[PDB]
Amino acid sequence: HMISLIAALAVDRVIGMENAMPWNLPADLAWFKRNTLNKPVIMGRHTWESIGRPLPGRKNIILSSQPGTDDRVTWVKSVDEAIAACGDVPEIMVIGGGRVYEQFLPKAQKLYLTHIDAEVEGDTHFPDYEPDDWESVFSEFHDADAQNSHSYCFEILERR
Ligand SMILES: NC(=O)c1ccc[n+]([C@@H]2O[C@H](COP(=O)([O-])OP(=O)(O)OC[C@H]3O[C@@H](n4cnc5c(N)ncnc54)[C@H](OP(=O)(O)O)[C@@H]3O)[C@@H](O)[C@H]2O)c1
Ligand SMILES: Nc1nc(=O)c2nc(CNc3ccc(C(=O)N[C@@H](CCC(=O)O)C(=O)O)cc3)cnc2[nH]1
């Protein structure tokens, strides 16, 4: 079954700063919802803790080496178990964070990336995806506006 990563990236492919997103892009949360709704979502336990509630309309699969602590979601102990728990679906969405993106990138056939023109530091970064391995198949640049303080570009890449 097909695996896709979806992530919002600032400069340095930064995706996280102290457990939360260091910038803000409201337009990205329509894009994330659009591209994950009615698909299983795999996430690491830290990303699960940052969302506080199951993503509605999606099967939420949480990677953790410890037993689960919430029966509204599906708990798994390995990458392959996480994939198996998704069942036979057209597309599995891996929604972070850094540790989980790193493990799933070699398994993924598609990346949904938002590039945010935000100069910010963070400890967590999206994995360095090989340009030689990935073909951009969709790109749309958006200037800042009254809801988004940064310009941003929605991208979809497909694995070669
Ligand atoms: N901007 C974005 O696109 C985006 C998306 C999501 C999150 N983020 C940011 O990224 C950061 C979190 O990423 P993270 O790397 O800190 O943590 P994470 O990847 O969300 O989850 C890490 C935890 O998941 C569990 N885990 C992951 N792989 C596992 C495996 N193969 N087997 C067993 N357990 C596994 C472990 O939990 P145990 O310790 O319980 O074993 C590990 O400590 C936050 O800052 C968050 O805001 C950004
Ligand atoms: N690709 C990607 N982009 C992100 O901005 C992102 N952000 C988080 C963490 N941030 C959050 C914080 C709150 C909600 C939330 O309240 N969920 C609501 C609305 C989400 C939305 O606006 O689409 C929900 O649908 O229940 C979602 C993500 C995790 N993975 C991501 N993945």
Curated annotation (Swiss-Prot):
Keywords, comma-separated and alphabetical: Antibiotic resistance, Methotrexate resistance, NADP, One-carbon metabolism, Oxidoreductase, Trimethoprim resistance
Domain DHFR: 2-159
Superkingdom assignment: Bacteria
GO cellular component, one term: cytosol
Catalytic activity: (6S)-5,6,7,8-tetrahydrofolate + NADP(+) = 7,8-dihydrofolate + NADPH + H(+)
Pfam families cross-referenced by the UniProt entry: DHFR_1
CDD domains: DHFR
Effect annotated for changing M17N: Increases catalytic rate about 2-fold. Increases catalytic rate about 7-fold
Sequence positions that bind substrate: I6, D28, R53, R58, T114
Keyword rRNA-binding listed: no
Pathway: Cofactor biosynthesis; tetrahydrofolate biosynthesis; 5,6,7,8-tetrahydrofolate from 7,8-dihydrofolate: step 1/1
GO molecular function: dihydrofolate reductase activity; dihydrofolic acid binding; folic acid binding; methotrexate binding; NADP binding; NADP+ binding; NADPH binding
Enzyme class label: oxidoreductase
NCBIfam families found in the cross-reference section: PRK10769.1 (NF008037)
Function: Key enzyme in folate metabolism. Catalyzes an essential reaction for de novo glycine and purine synthesis, and for DNA precursor synthesis.
UniProt protein name: Dihydrofolate reductase
Gene that encodes it: folA
